[PDB]
């Protein structure tokens, strides 16, 4: 469980770019594992191997030869087939479980006021939940205990690139009183929901 396996790129029979993509799709953990390898010439995928299909298939004319060849080379076709177990099943249950899957990053809740306005009609409160991993997170805006859903707007997920995401949730308010605005956040890395408060 400490060795990360790759997906072997086959050899064809004897500004230019090529790409080889080893891709493994895990449905409900390792319950359903799917292997897809793609050979690209510039931006055109020409041949592909899919677990679901079991063999190499040409995606375009440029791939017709590699498919007919590799499928006939027992060593190749049979090495690729088992690659779903050798590399995926292995990499998932092994490496990934002791690393990516165990990573938990507690987000950082902060309510700020739109850089300079709460003007031109209806004040906008912004909650900034940043630096969390993994992506499953639940962020809700509350008003004095009551959950606020109207006037609320959330951005899509922002992938920072360093194994951390962030998300901003806006709330346009027409306020009043000793009101409290609680930004409820719920992340798997947290024991109990972190919350930030703000008042009129």
């Amino acid at each position: 469980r400490g060795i990360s396996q790759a997906v072997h790129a086959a050899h064809a029979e004897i500004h230019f770019v090529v790409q080889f993509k080893g891709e493994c799709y895990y449905t409900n953990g390792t319950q359903r594992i799917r292997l897809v390898t793609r050979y690209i010439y510039n931006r055109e995928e020409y041949v592909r191997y899919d677990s679901d299909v079991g063999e190499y298939r040409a995606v375009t004319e440029l791939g017709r030869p590699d498919a007919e060849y590799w499928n006939s080379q027992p060593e190749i076709l049979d090495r690729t087939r088992a690659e779903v177990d050798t590399a995926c099943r292995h990499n998932y249950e092994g490496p990934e479980t002791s690393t990516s899957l165990r990573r938990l990053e507690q987000p950082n809740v902060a309510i700020s006021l739109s850089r300079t306005e709460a003007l031109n009609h209806h004040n906008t409160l912004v909650c900034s939940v940043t630096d969390f991993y993994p992506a499953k997170i639940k962020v809700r805006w509350f008003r004095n205990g009551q959950e606020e859903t109207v006037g609320v707007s959330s951005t899509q997920l922002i992938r920072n690139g360093d194994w951390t995401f962030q998300v901003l949730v806006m709330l346009e308010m027409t306020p009043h009183q000793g009101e409290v605005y609680t930004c409820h956040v719920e992340h798997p890395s947290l024991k109990s929901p972190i919350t930030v408060e703000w008042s009129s």
Binding site: G2, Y25, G29, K136, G161
Partner: protein, 178 residues
């Protein structure tokens, strides 16, 4: 659990220049890349490189497999070359911008084909480098790529920034101001 997709074996290779790359990612995040000219595995998360191992040879084989395949495909295609695409960048803080508070600025360049780019930061209009970091060419479904850069800064001063994006399926470098 949830959907998870591993990217294991990803190899790129370009002809004039014998420029290639090899990486591994999980759920869109770069696990590591293998330094080819010096034959070593560079983990994006060091702590990760201390609990799991990936022998470089593996990456090295695929690079060779692709060098091989390129020469064969290029011919097969009767030498059709890569058509150029224009990248789009986006600059944004990794954290809440606080006056005087150290932060890291991020530039998100997408639609990168080929994996050839010079993305450059400057308050000036002449560079400044420390905290300047880059990711490998991250792979896109459409077989285009995307790269991210960072800048480590604290916000009051000279405050004008710019991410300069030089790519030839492109013209003004792309000065994306923030």
């Amino acid at each position: 659990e949830a959907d998870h997709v591993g990217f294991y074996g990803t190899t790129v290779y370009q002809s004039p220049g014998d420029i290639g790359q090899y990486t591994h990612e999980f759920d869109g995040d770069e696990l590591f890349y293998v330094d080819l000219d010096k034959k070593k595995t560079v983990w994006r998360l060091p702590e990760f490189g201390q609990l799991i191992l990936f022998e470089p040879q593996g990456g090295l084989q695929n690079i060779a497999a692709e060098k091989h395949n390129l020469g064969i495909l290029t011919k097969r295609s009767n030498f059709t070359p890569a058509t150029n695409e224009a990248p789009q960048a986006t600059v944004f803080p990794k954290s809440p911008v606080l006056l005087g508070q150290p932060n890291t600025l991020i530039c998100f360049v997408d639609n990168i084909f080929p994996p050839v780019i010079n993305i450059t930061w400057l308050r000036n209009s002449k560079s400044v480098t420390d905290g300047v970091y880059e990711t490998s060419f991250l792979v896109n479904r459409d077989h285009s790529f995307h790269k991210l850069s960072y800048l480590t800064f604290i916000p009051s001063d000279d405050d004008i920034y710019d991410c300069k994006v030089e790519h030839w399926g492109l013209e003004e470098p792309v000065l994306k101001h923030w």
